[PDB]
C-alpha cells in the first residue's frame, strides 16, 4: 500500500563507495571554484588596466591637441625669421611624441586580446562547473539515501563511521 | 631594474623621455627634468618648477595630482611611467582626498560614477555632506574632547576592589628628568598631576595637562580610579612600575590641527521573462528559469516556471510570467528572485534577486537587466535563493544574465504608501491568555501564529519582548495586516540591546523593523557596540538598499570614536575584494574617510606596510622552494633593508592596536616559518612584534577570538578574571591578515624536549616565590580556556596549538575549526591537570577549585547564551563554512544547555567534567 534492497554490508560497502566518489567530486568542484574566482579577479584587473590605458592615451591626446594649438604661434614666428632650426626641432620632438601612442595603442591592444582569451576561459570553467553540480547533487542525495537506510535497519553509529570516514 | 625610462608631458606640448631612478622622489625628478629641458624647444614660456605638479594615471586607473613630492616614483606606482606637468589650480584639498581615497579603498572612486546609478549619486551625495560635517563640528571641539574622539579610555570591565600605595614614574615633555612617587590605587588621574606639579613648583595648571603612557597613544583622564584603567590594572598584576608622561594641552591641540495609490491597483503581479544571455550550459539538456517572490525567509505566493527553451547561450522565451499575488498586496521589502536551471526534459545554474519597490519607494517599471550569481550546490538545497543579496553581479562583461520587464501598472507612476497612509489603515481594528501565555512564557504551528495575531494587541501590552515572535505570524502578503503589525511597531516599547540584536536577523526585512533595532541599539556604549562590531558590519550584507539605518549608525559612531572608526575600516577594507560587497563597502569606506582625514594619515601608511609585506611575503615563498630556511631568511633581510621597504615598514600605528606604535623595524629579529602559506614574524622596538599572513582567511580565527574576549568580558563582570590571552586578529585583505604576537611564550610541544618540564619550565621561569603565582594563572587560565573550547566546539586542540607564558597563562591559538567541525567533549589534559596539582598525584583542595572555576565559568556564559545565539545568527551573513545554517547555532544552544534549567545543565557539566578526568588518564 505504502510505496515509495539486499544485506546492511553491501549496502554499508556502497555507502563507503559513493562517499568516496562525493568526497572526490566535490573537491574537484571546489578546484574549479578556486579558478572561477581567480579568474574573475583577475579580469576585473585586467578590465581596469584597459581604463588605465585609455586615460593615459587620453592624455597624450590632449598633449597632442596642445601641441597643435600652442606651437602654431611659435612656428609663424621662427617663419619669418629664417629659425627654421627650431621649426623642424618642435615638429620632430612632436613626431616623437604620436610615435610614443602607437607604442601605447598596441600595448592596450596586446591587452585586449588577452582579456577576451581569459573571458574564454571564464565560460568554460562556468560551462565545467554546470556539468559537475548534477554528479555532485546526485552523489550526495545518494550518500544520504545510503545512510537513513542504514540508520532505519539500526546500523551502530560506529559503523556507519568507519564507512564514511 | 635600478633605472626606468619616464615620458614628461610639458604643457607647451612638447615631449621629454629618460631614464630616472626608480627610488627618486618626485622633487629630484623635478630638477632632472629642468635640467634637460632648457635644451629642448619652448623652454622660456614655462614659468619656474614649484608653480606645476605632475600628474599621473595611478593603479585605480584614475588621474592623480601628486602634490606631495617627497614620495618616490616606486611608492607612487603610476600605470606607466608617464607624468605630465599641470597647473597648480581649482580645490586641490578636495582633488588631493579624493585620490588618496581611491588609493586606501582599493576601489577607484571613478567606477562609482561609471555605473551611471541615482542610488550610488544619492548615497555619495548625502553620506558625503553628513561625514564632512561631523568632521567640521569635530574640529571645533576643544583638546579635552578631541582626545576623547581620538583616544578615547581603554578601561577594565569593572567601570560601565582594594586599596593599595604603589609607585608611578612621572616625567615631562622634553624633560629627561622623571619622578619616582607613592600614589593610591583609588586616586583619580587629576590628583596624581597635581603631585608631579608640586614637584615641578618645587624646582602652568593641573587642569592643562593630561597623562600619556609613554610609547603609547593611550591617555589617562577622566573621573576614574587609577586600577580601572588596563594600563595600570596590567602594571598592578604584573608588579611594575607604570611610566607616565605628562603632556601639555596646547601638544594635543597641535595634533588636532595637524497620482494613483498602491491599494487600489488590484491587479495580479507579473513580469516578461524576455531573454537569458552568456549561459554556458550543457548542449544535450534544456533550460528553466524559476521565479518567486519573497520577503524575508517567507515566500508571499506560490513559485511559477519558465517553459523548456532549448539550452544555448541566448536563450529566448517572451513569457508573462503570473503569481498569486495582487500589486496591492506587495509589501515594501518585496523580492523577486530567479534561479536558472538546466534540467534533462538538475542543475542550478545561476540566480538573481530584484526588489520590486526602489530605493525612493517607487514601484519599478520597464525593462531590467538582471546579472546572475552562480549557485553553490550546498546541503539545503533550495529551488531559489532568496537570502542572496539584491545587488547585481559587477562582472557585466562575462557573467550570465536574465533581461525581463516588469509591466506598466498606471500611467503615472506609483510608490509604497507613506507612514501617515499605513497608520490611518492600520489604526481601525483568564481565558485566551492562557493560550497565549504558554506560546510566549517558557517554530511555531499555524493554529498558534492564528492566535498570536488575534491576540497581538495583547502582545505589545503584556509581552512585548515577543515582537519578533509576533513580526513572524504576520501575512506579509496581505497588505491589510502589513499595515495593522506597522501600526503596532510604531507604538511598541523600546526593547533591550539583546531584543535588538535578533531583529538584525535576514528574518526581519522590514525597514520599520530595522529603524526599531538600530533604535534600541542606541543606548549602546561605544565599549560594548565594539564586541559587537564585526556583526553589525556582516548584517548589512542583508540590506536592500545602499542608504540604510544601520550605515548611517555605524557612520555616526565611527565618526564620534576613531577606535570604531578604525576598526569599522579593516572590517569593510578586509573585504572589498568580495564582488558582492565591494559597492556598498566602497562607498561606505569613501563617506567614513572623508569625516576623518587624520586617521587616513594613519591608515595609508598601515596599507603601504601592508602591500610591502605582501610583496615580502611573496618573495619569500618563491625563495623557500628554492633555497633552504638560512639563506632565505637572510634573503627577506636584505629585502626588507631597501630605503622603499624599511621605510614602509617603519613608523607606523598598529592595525592590531592603533594605540601602539611600531616605531624601528628589528630586521635581525624577524623571520618566518616554512609552513602551510609561509607567514612572517615581524619584530620592532615595549617590543611588540605582528605575524602577517598570506594564503589564508583569518576570519573565522577572529571571530573565535572575538567570542574568547566577549567570553573573558562578561566573566570579568561578575569578579572573576581567568587571566586569558585573547590576542589581537585582523583580515586586512584577501586571504590577509595580521596577528599580535604574545611574548615570551611558547608552545607546549617544545616545552616538552618523568617529563615535569611543564613544571620545571615554570620553575626556571617564576623561580622561588614566584612559582605559586605561575601556577594559580595556569589554573585560571587553563579552566578558561577549557570552557571556552568546549563551549564552541573547538577541537583539534594539540601541543602545538596551545601555548603557555612566562607568567604561567595558558592560551590557544590558530582556532581553524569550531562548532564540532560531531559534539566535542569537554578535555582535561593530565599534564594540566599535574601542574594544577602542583606536581601531586592527589591535591584535592587545589583540584576543587579549579573545578570550581570551571563551573562558574560554565554558569556565566549560559546566563548570556541569547547573546552567543543571536551575535551568532548574524555571523551567518559571512558565509563561513562552519557557520552556514541552524545546526551550526543549534550546537551552541546544546553546548550551554539552554533548553535545560541551571541546575539540570550544572549536573549535566559535572558528568562531562568528571568523565573528562577519567579520560584524562586513559
Ligand atoms: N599570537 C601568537 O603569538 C602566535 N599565533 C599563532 C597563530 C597562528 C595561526 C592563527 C592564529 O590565530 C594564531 N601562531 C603562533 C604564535 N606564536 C607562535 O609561536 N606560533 C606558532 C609558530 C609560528 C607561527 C607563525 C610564524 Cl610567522 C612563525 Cl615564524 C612561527
Given amino acids: 500500500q505504502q510505496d515509495q534492497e539486499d544485506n546492511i554490508e553491501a549496502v554499508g560497502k556502497k555507502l563507503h563507495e559513493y562517499n568516496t566518489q562525493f568526497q572526490e567530486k566535490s573537491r574537484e568542484y571546489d578546484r574549479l571554484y578556486e579558478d572561477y574566482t581567480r579568474t574573475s579577479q583577475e579580469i576585473q584587473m585586467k578590465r581596469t588596466a584597459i581604463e588605465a590605458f585609455n586615460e593615459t592615451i587620453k592624455i597624450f591626446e590632449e598633449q597632442c591637441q596642445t601641441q597643435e594649438r600652442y606651437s602654431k604661434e611659435y612656428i609663424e614666428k621662427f617663419k619669418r625669421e629664417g629659425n627654421e632650426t627650431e621649426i623642424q626641432r618642435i615638429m620632430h620632438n612632436y613626431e616623437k611624441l604620436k610615435s610614443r601612442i602607437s607604442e601605447i595603442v598596441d600595448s592596450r591592444r596586446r591587452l585586449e586580446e588577452d582579456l577576451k582569451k581569459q573571458a574564454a576561459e571564464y565560460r568554460e570553467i562556468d560551462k565545467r562547473m554546470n556539468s559537475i553540480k548534477p554528479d555532485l547533487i546526485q552523489l550526495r542525495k545518494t550518500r544520504d539515501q545510503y545512510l537513513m537506510w542504514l540508520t532505519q535497519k539500526g546500523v551502530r553509529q560506529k559503523k556507519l563511521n568507519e564507512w564514511l570516514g | 631594474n635600478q633605472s626606468v625610462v619616464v615620458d614628461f608631458l610639458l604643457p607647451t606640448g612638447v615631449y621629454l623621455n629618460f631614464p630616472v631612478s626608480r627610488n627618486a622622489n618626485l622633487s629630484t625628478i623635478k630638477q632632472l627634468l629642468w635640467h634637460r629641458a632648457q635644451y629642448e624647444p619652448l623652454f622660456h614660456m614655462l614659468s619656474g618648477p614649484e608653480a606645476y605638479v605632475f600628474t599621473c594615471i595611478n593603479q585605480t586607473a584614475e588621474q592623480q595630482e601628486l602634490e606631495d613630492e617627497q614620495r618616490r616614483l616606486c611608492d607612487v606606482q603610476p600605470f606607466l611611467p608617464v607624468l605630465r606637468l599641470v597647473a597648480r589650480e581649482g580645490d586641490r584639498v578636495k582633488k588631493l582626498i579624493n585620490s588618496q581615497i581611491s588609493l586606501l579603498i582599493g576601489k577607484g572612486l571613478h567606477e562609482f560614477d561609471s555605473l551611471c546609478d541615482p542610488e550610488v549619486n544619492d548615497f555619495r551625495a548625502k553620506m558625503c555632506q553628513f561625514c564632512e560635517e561631523a568632521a567640521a563640528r569635530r574640529q571645533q571641539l576643544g583638546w579635552e574632547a578631541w582626545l576623547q574622539y581620538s583616544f578615547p579610555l581603554q578601561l577594565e570591565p569593572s567601570a560601565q576592589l582594594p586599596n593599595r ?594 613544571l620545571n619550565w615554570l620553575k626556571s621561569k617564576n623561580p622561588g616565590e614566584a612559582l605559586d603565582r605561575a601556577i594559580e594563572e595556569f589554573t585560571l587560565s587553563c579552566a578558561g580556556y577549557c570552557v571556552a573550547t568546549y563551549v564552541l566546539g573547538i577541537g583539534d586542540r594539540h601541543s602545538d596549538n596551545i601555548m603557555i607564558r612566562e607568567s604561567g597563562q595558558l592560551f590557544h591559538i590558530d582556532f581553524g575549526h569550531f562548532l564540532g567541525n560531531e559534539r566535542v567533549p569537554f578535555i582535561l589534559t593530565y599534564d594540566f591537570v599535574h601542574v594544577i596539582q602542583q606536581g601531586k598525584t592527589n591535591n584535592s583542595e587545589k583540584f576543587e577549585r579549579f573545578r570550581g572555576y570551571c563551573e562558574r565559568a560554565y554558569t556565566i556564559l549560559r546566563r548570556h547564551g541569547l547573546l552567543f545565539l543571536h551575535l551568532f545568527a548574524l555571523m551567518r551573513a559571512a558565509g563561513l563554512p562552519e557557520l552556514s545554517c541552524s545546526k551550526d547555532i543549534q550546537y551552541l544552544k546544546d553546548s550551554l544547555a539552554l533548553g535545560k534549567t541551571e541546575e539540570e545543565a550544572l549536573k549535566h557539566f559535572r558528568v562531562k567534567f568528571n568523565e573528562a578526568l577519567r579520560e584524562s588518564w586513559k
Fill in chain 2, 165 to 758: 600605595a604603589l609607585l608611578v614614574n612621572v616625567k615631562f615633555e622634553g624633560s629627561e628628568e622623571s619622578f619616582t612617587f607613592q600614589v593610591s590605587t583609588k586616586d583619580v588621574p587629576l590628583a596624581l598631576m597635581a603631585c608631579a606639579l608640586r614637584k615641578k613648583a618645587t624646582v602652568e595648571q593641573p587642569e592643562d595637562y593630561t597623562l600619556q603612557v609613554n610609547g603609547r597613544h593611550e591617555y589617562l583622564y577622566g573621573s576614574y580610579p587609577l586600577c580601572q584603567f588596563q594600563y595600570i590594572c596590567s602594571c598592578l598584576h604584573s608588579g611594575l612600575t607604570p611610566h607616565l608622561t605628562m603632556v601639555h594641552s596646547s601638544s594635543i591641540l597641535a595634533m588636532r590641527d595637524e497620482s494613483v495609490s498602491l491599494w487600489s491597483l488590484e491587479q495580479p503581479f507579473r513580469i516578461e521573462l524576455i531573454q537569458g544571455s552568456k549561459v554556458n550550459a550543457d548542449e544535450r539538456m534544456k533550460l528553466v528559469v524559476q521565479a518567486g517572490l519573497f520577503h524575508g525567509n517567507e515566500m508571499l505566493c506560490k513559485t511559477v516556471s519558465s517553459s523548456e527553451v532549448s539550452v544555448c547561450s541566448e536563450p529566448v522565451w517572451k513569457q508573462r510570467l503570473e503569481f498569486d499575488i495582487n500589486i496591492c498586496d506587495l509589501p515594501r521589502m518585496a523580492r523577486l528572485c530567479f534561479a536558472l536551471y538546466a534540467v534533462i526534459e538538475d542543475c542550478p545554474i545561476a540566480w538573481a534577486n530584484l526588489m520590486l519597490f526602489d530605493y525612493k519607494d517607487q514601484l519599478k517599471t520597464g525593462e531590467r537587466c538582471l546579472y546572475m550569481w552562480p549557485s553553490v550546490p550546498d546541503e539545503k538545497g533550495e529551488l531559489l535563493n532568496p537570502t542572496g543579496t539584491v545587488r547585481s553581479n559587477p562582472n557585466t562583461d562575462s557573467a550570465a544574465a536574465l533581461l525581463i520587464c516588469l509591466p506598466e501598472v498606471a500611467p503615472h507612476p506609483v510608490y509604497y504608501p507613506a507612514l501617515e497612509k499605513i497608520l490611518e489603515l492600520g489604526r481601525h481594528s483568564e481565558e485566551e491568555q492562557l493560550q497565549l501565555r504558554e506560546i510566549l512564557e517558557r517554530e511555531l504551528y499555524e493554529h498558534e501564529k492564528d492566535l498570536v495575531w488575534k491576540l497581538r494587541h495583547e502582545v505589545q501590552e503584556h509581552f512585548p519582548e515577543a515582537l519578533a515572535r509576533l513580526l513572524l505570524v504576520t501575512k506579509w502578503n496581505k497588505h491589510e495586516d502589513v499595515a495593522q503589525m506597522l501600526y503596532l511597531l510604531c507604538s511598541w516599547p523600546e526593547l533591550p540591546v539583546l531584543s535588538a540584536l535578533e531583529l538584525l536577523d535576514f528574518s526581519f526585512p522590514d525597514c520599520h523593523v530595522g529603524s526599531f533595532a538600530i533604535k534600541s541599539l542606541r543606548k549602546l556604549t561605544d565599549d560594548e557596540l565594539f564586541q559587537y562590531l564585526l556583526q553589525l558590519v556582516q548584517v548589512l550584507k542583508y540590506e536592500s538598499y545602499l542608504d540604510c539605518e544601520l550605515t548611517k549608525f555605524l557612520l555616526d559612531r565611527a565618526l564620534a570614536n576613531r577606535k570604531i572608526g578604525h576598526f569599522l575600516f579593516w572590517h569593510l577594507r578586509s573585504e572589498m575584494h568580495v564582488p558582492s560587497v565591494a559597492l556598498r563597502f566602497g562607498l561606505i569606506l569613501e563617506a567614513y574617510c572623508r569625516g576623518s582625514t587624520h586617521h587616513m594619515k594613519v591608515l595609508m601608511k598601515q596599507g603601504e606596510a601592508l602591500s610591502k609585506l605582501k610583496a615580502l611575503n611573496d618573495f619569500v615563498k618563491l625563495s623557500s622552494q628554492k633555497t633552504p630556511k638560512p639563506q632565505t631568511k637572510e634573503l627577506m633581510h636584505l629585502c626588507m633593508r631597501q630605503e622603499a621597504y624599511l621605510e614602509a615598514l617603519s613608523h607606523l600605528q598598529s592595525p592590531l592596536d592603533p594605540s601602539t606604535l611600531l616605531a624601528e623595524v628589528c630586521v635581525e629579529q624577524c623571520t618566518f616559518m616554512d609552513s602551510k602559506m609561509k607567514p612572517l614574524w615581524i619584530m620592532y622596538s615595549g617590543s611588540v612584534g605582528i605575524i602577517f599572513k598570506n594564503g589564508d582567511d583569518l576570519r573565522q580565527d577572529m571571530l573565535t577570538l572575538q567570542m574568547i574576549q566577549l567570553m573573558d568580558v562578561l566573566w570579568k563582570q561578575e569578579g572573576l578574571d581567568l587571566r586569558m590571552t585573547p590576542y589581537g586578529c585582523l583580515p586586512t585583505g584577501d586571504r590577509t591578515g595580521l596577528i599580535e604576537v604574545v611574548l615570551r611564550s611558547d608552545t607546549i610541544a617544545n616545552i616538552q624536549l618523568n617529563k615535569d618540564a611543564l
